[PDB]
Structures are given as structure tokens and as C-alpha cells.
Design an enzyme around this catalytic site. Structure first.
Site, PDB file in Angstrom:
ATOM      1  N   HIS A 133      -6.310   3.840  -8.440  1.00 44.90           N
ATOM      2  CA  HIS A 133      -6.162   2.228  -8.271  1.00 44.90           C
ATOM      3  C   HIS A 133      -6.842   1.903  -9.945  1.00 44.90           C
ATOM      4  CE1 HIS A 133      -6.686   2.058  -3.843  1.00 44.90           C
ATOM      5  NE2 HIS A 133      -7.945   3.609  -3.369  1.00 44.90           N
ATOM      6  N   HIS A 152       0.826  -1.289  -1.974  1.00 40.71           N
ATOM      7  CA  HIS A 152      -1.019  -1.747  -2.874  1.00 40.71           C
ATOM      8  C   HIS A 152      -0.856  -0.638  -3.530  1.00 40.71           C
ATOM      9  CE1 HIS A 152      -1.585  -4.026   1.058  1.00 40.71           C
ATOM     10  NE2 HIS A 152      -1.072  -2.712   1.988  1.00 40.71           N
ATOM     11  N   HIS A 208      -2.660   8.518  -4.420  1.00 40.62           N
ATOM     12  CA  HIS A 208      -2.603   7.489  -5.173  1.00 40.62           C
ATOM     13  C   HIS A 208      -3.926   7.492  -5.589  1.00 40.62           C
ATOM     14  CE1 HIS A 208      -5.204   7.241  -1.481  1.00 40.62           C
ATOM     15  NE2 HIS A 208      -5.792   5.687  -2.828  1.00 40.62           N
ATOM     16  N   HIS A 215      -6.848   8.939  -6.182  1.00 38.88           N
ATOM     17  CA  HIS A 215      -7.931   9.513  -4.228  1.00 38.88           C
ATOM     18  C   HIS A 215      -6.727  11.074  -4.633  1.00 38.88           C
ATOM     19  CE1 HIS A 215     -10.045   5.982  -4.401  1.00 38.88           C
ATOM     20  NE2 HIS A 215     -10.570   6.796  -5.003  1.00 38.88           N
ATOM     21  N   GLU A 245     -12.368   2.647  -8.569  1.00 41.25           N
ATOM     22  CA  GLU A 245     -13.229   1.971  -7.278  1.00 41.25           C
ATOM     23  C   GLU A 245     -14.832   2.435  -7.792  1.00 41.25           C
ATOM     24  OE1 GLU A 245     -11.232   3.035  -3.858  1.00 41.25           O
ATOM     25  OE2 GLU A 245     -10.113   1.220  -4.216  1.00 41.25           O
ATOM     26  N   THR A 305     -11.252   3.087   0.995  1.00 43.85           N
ATOM     27  CA  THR A 305     -11.555   1.850   0.609  1.00 43.85           C
ATOM     28  C   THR A 305     -11.079   1.079   1.048  1.00 43.85           C
ATOM     29  OG1 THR A 305      -9.580   2.501  -1.626  1.00 43.85           O
ATOM     30  CG2 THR A 305     -12.397   3.437  -0.881  1.00 43.85           C
ATOM     31  N   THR A 306      -9.406   0.748   1.366  1.00 45.53           N
ATOM     32  CA  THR A 306      -8.396   0.036   2.217  1.00 45.53           C
ATOM     33  C   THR A 306      -8.418  -0.113   3.794  1.00 45.53           C
ATOM     34  OG1 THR A 306      -6.488   1.987   1.966  1.00 45.53           O
ATOM     35  CG2 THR A 306      -6.768  -0.038   0.128  1.00 45.53           C
TER      36      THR A 306
HETATM   37  N1  LIG Z   1      -7.915   4.879  -1.472  1.00 47.17           N
HETATM   38  S1  LIG Z   1      -8.586   5.620   0.168  1.00 47.17           S
HETATM   39  O1  LIG Z   1     -10.246   5.889   0.414  1.00 47.17           O
HETATM   40  O2  LIG Z   1      -9.000   7.337  -0.198  1.00 47.17           O
HETATM   41  C1  LIG Z   1      -7.387   6.070   1.678  1.00 47.17           C
HETATM   42  C2  LIG Z   1      -7.272   7.620   1.940  1.00 47.17           C
HETATM   43  C3  LIG Z   1      -6.300   7.184   3.079  1.00 47.17           C
HETATM   44  C4  LIG Z   1      -5.580   5.911   3.683  1.00 47.17           C
HETATM   45  N2  LIG Z   1      -5.104   5.514   4.279  1.00 47.17           N
HETATM   46  S2  LIG Z   1      -4.123   6.709   5.253  1.00 47.17           S
HETATM   47  O3  LIG Z   1      -3.142   6.413   6.317  1.00 47.17           O
HETATM   48  O4  LIG Z   1      -4.210   8.342   4.322  1.00 47.17           O
HETATM   49  C5  LIG Z   1      -5.681   7.827   6.160  1.00 47.17           C
HETATM   50  C6  LIG Z   1      -5.177   9.186   6.601  1.00 47.17           C
HETATM   51  N3  LIG Z   1      -3.426   8.995   7.619  1.00 47.17           N
HETATM   52  C7  LIG Z   1      -3.844   8.435   8.799  1.00 47.17           C
HETATM   53  O5  LIG Z   1      -4.577   8.599   9.446  1.00 47.17           O
HETATM   54  N4  LIG Z   1      -2.290   8.428   8.881  1.00 47.17           N
HETATM   55  C8  LIG Z   1      -2.140   7.806  11.367  1.00 47.17           C
HETATM   56  C9  LIG Z   1      -2.976   7.950  11.622  1.00 47.17           C
HETATM   57  C10 LIG Z   1      -2.891   7.531  12.656  1.00 47.17           C
HETATM   58  C11 LIG Z   1      -1.646   8.070  13.354  1.00 47.17           C
HETATM   59  C12 LIG Z   1      -0.871   8.668  12.048  1.00 47.17           C
HETATM   60  C13 LIG Z   1      -0.846   8.593  10.638  1.00 47.17           C
HETATM   61  C14 LIG Z   1      -6.620   4.742   2.714  1.00 47.17           C
HETATM   62  C15 LIG Z   1      -7.620   4.883   1.727  1.00 47.17           C
HETATM   63 ZN   LIG Z   2      -7.614   5.268  -2.881  1.00 52.16          ZN
END
Ligand SMILES: NS(=O)(=O)c1ccc(NS(=O)(=O)CCNC(=O)Nc2ccccc2)cc1
Ligand SMILES: [Zn+2]
Length: 257
Positions: free
Chosen positions: A93, A61, A91, A116, A103, A195-196
């Protein structure tokens, strides 16, 4: 499984993640006529001097760069935040053309991309516990516009050919995220969400006023990435952005007049 296409994109996400229709979803449009200056907001404190990058990877993604979040190396502090937030990853977008990709929008203006920088609140111990908390994460969002080249981005761009398809990754140590920041740390802030998927409402958003400028040469390299894995049918990774969601009952505050 979810993506950004017609058949799996943002209009479908609520079926697996009903919070997609929630009260504090991200991103949003930032209307500068209603995002009022708040003199109680403090300057943002970005401490990235001991940031320790680990790897860069294509997760199907976006591409993300990961960091060692085991100590208070790289932390975000101050601004609207209480306590200390450790840098986990960054990362981007981006769009199928320079005219879109971000976004968040500013007075409905779409930028060419958005960075982000993802941080989690150390009072919760780890990120898996932090994502369950309304104040668990802080994401520093930085717009990208096409202009002069951003030298701090070049190490990233120069390695993207090695992670063209989903699942590829590369060694990516000693990258300094200070090189991705604009001059000003003036910001907008509001409570929001990932946002994902899983779209959890656990994010204090901090969106910088000033975009960084990256060259057309640099952002074109983003658009050579693939959503698919190797040997699968090519689907270029472009327009991997969720559109603006309703602000509903929230306030966006500005740190600047
Ligand atoms: N586009 S954004 O809004 O900035 C954005 C930023 C980060 C994410 N996803 S993420 O995975 O990094 C969330 C933080 N990480 C976890 O929760 N890991 C986890 C969870 C359960 C068990 C073990 C580890 C998605 C969108
Ligand atoms: Zn993001």
C-alpha cells in the site's frame, strides 16, 4: 465496485461489507505510549528459505506476488502465534507522495508505504476456510521509508512496467522474500481484520518496529501503476491505503521494551 476514490473508497465499503464498522477493524494507529511491552510475547520465527514465488499481478487495488502454499515451505511461527502459518502472498500500500501511504501509523506518523506478508493458519486446511476463523490469518506488516535502496526489492520494481494495468500478470519465480525484511524482528501485535474487502476479522496483526528503507527511485515505480485496465481511462494507483480505524476495546502489545 470498491476502490480508493471519492465514490468507491473506504467511506463506502460498509454498505457491501457492514463489518467495516466492526469491533476489530484494521489498520489502527499504534500509540507507543499505550502499546505496552508484554514479556510473554515470544520472538517471531520467519522461515522463508524454501519460499516458492509463482506470479506477480496487478489486481486493480495493488500489486501482489503469490507463492506456492501447498507445503510448509515458507511459514511464520512463534511471536503471538499458536501453530504454523503458510505464506500465501505479499502486496503493498503506498501514497501519492512520500509523506503518506502506510496503513498502520505509529504515533500518528504515516510512512511512505507498507508491505503486507499474508499467511494462513494450517490447522484450517486452506485459506478459504482460514478466513472464516478469528485466528485464520497472520499478516506481517512492514513499513517502508524513503532512504537507501533495498536490494531485495529490485526484482519486484524491475518487473512492474510489465503489469501496469489491472489484470496484467507476469511470471515471477525464485523471488526470495527474506530480502524484504528489516534487521530487527521486534514487533507490535493486535487482533484485527483484512484492510480491504471483505474486511473479515480474521487477522492476527504483527507489525514490525523497524521500517525498511527503499530508494525514492524504487518507490516512484510503485506510483506508475494503474487502477484501471488497459484502454480504460488512466487512474494512477496511488493512495491505495485504508486510514486508521478506531482501536475500540482492543490492546496492542509490544514484543520489545
Ligand atoms: N491488506 S491485508 O489486510 O493484508 C489483506 C490480505 C489479504 C486479503 N485478501 S485475500 O484474498 O488474500 C484473504 C486470504 N485469501 C482467501 O481468503 N482466498 C479465498 C477465499 C474464498 C475462497 C477461496 C479462496 C485482503 C487484505
Ligand atoms: Zn494489505
Amino acid at each position: 465496485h470498491w476502490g480508493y476514490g471519492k465514490h468507491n473508497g473506504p467511506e463506502h465499503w460498509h454498505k457491501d461489507f457492514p463489518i467495516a464498522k466492526g469491533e476489530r477493524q484494521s489498520p489502527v494507529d499504534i500509540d507507543t505510549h499505550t502499546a505496552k511491552y508484554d514479556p510473554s510475547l515470544k520472538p517471531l520465527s520467519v522461515s522463508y528459505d524454501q519460499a516458492t514465488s509463482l506470479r506477480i499481478l496487478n489486481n486493480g487495488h495493488s500489486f501482489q506476488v503469490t507463492f506456492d502454499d501447498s507445503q510448509d515451505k515458507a511459514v511464520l511461527k512463534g511471536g503471538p502465534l499458536d501453530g504454523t502459518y503458510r505464506l500465501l502472498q505479499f502486496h503493498f500500500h503506498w501514497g501519492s507522495l512520500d509523506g503518506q501511504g502506510s496503513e498502520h501509523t505509529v504515533d500518528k506518523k504515516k510512512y511512505a508505504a507498507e508491505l503486507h506478508l499474508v499467511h494462513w493458519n494450517t490447522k484450517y486446511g486452506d485459506v478459504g476456510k482460514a478466513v472464516q476463523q478469528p485466528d485464520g490469518l497472520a499478516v506481517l506488516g512492514i513499513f517502508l521509508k524513503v532512504g537507501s535502496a533495498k536490494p531485495g526489492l529490485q526484482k519486484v520494481v524491475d518487473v512492474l512496467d510489465s503489469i501496469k494495468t489491472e489484470g496484467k500478470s507476469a511470471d515471477f519465480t525464485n523471488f526470495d522474500p527474506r530480502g524484504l525484511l528489516p534487521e530487527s524482528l521486534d514487533y507490535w501485535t493486535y487482533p484485527g481484520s483484512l484492510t480491504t474487502p471483505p474486511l473479515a476479522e480474521c487477522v492476527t496483526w504483527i507489525v514490525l518496529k523497524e521500517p525498511i528503507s527503499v530508494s525514492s527511485e524504487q518507490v516512484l515505480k510503485f506510483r506508475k501503476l494503474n487502477f484501471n485496465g488497459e484502454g480504460e481511462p488512466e487512474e494512477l494507483m496511488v493512495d491505495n491505503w485504508r486510514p486508521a480505524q478506531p482501536l475500540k476495546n482492543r490492546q496492542i502489545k509490544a514484543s520489545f521494551k
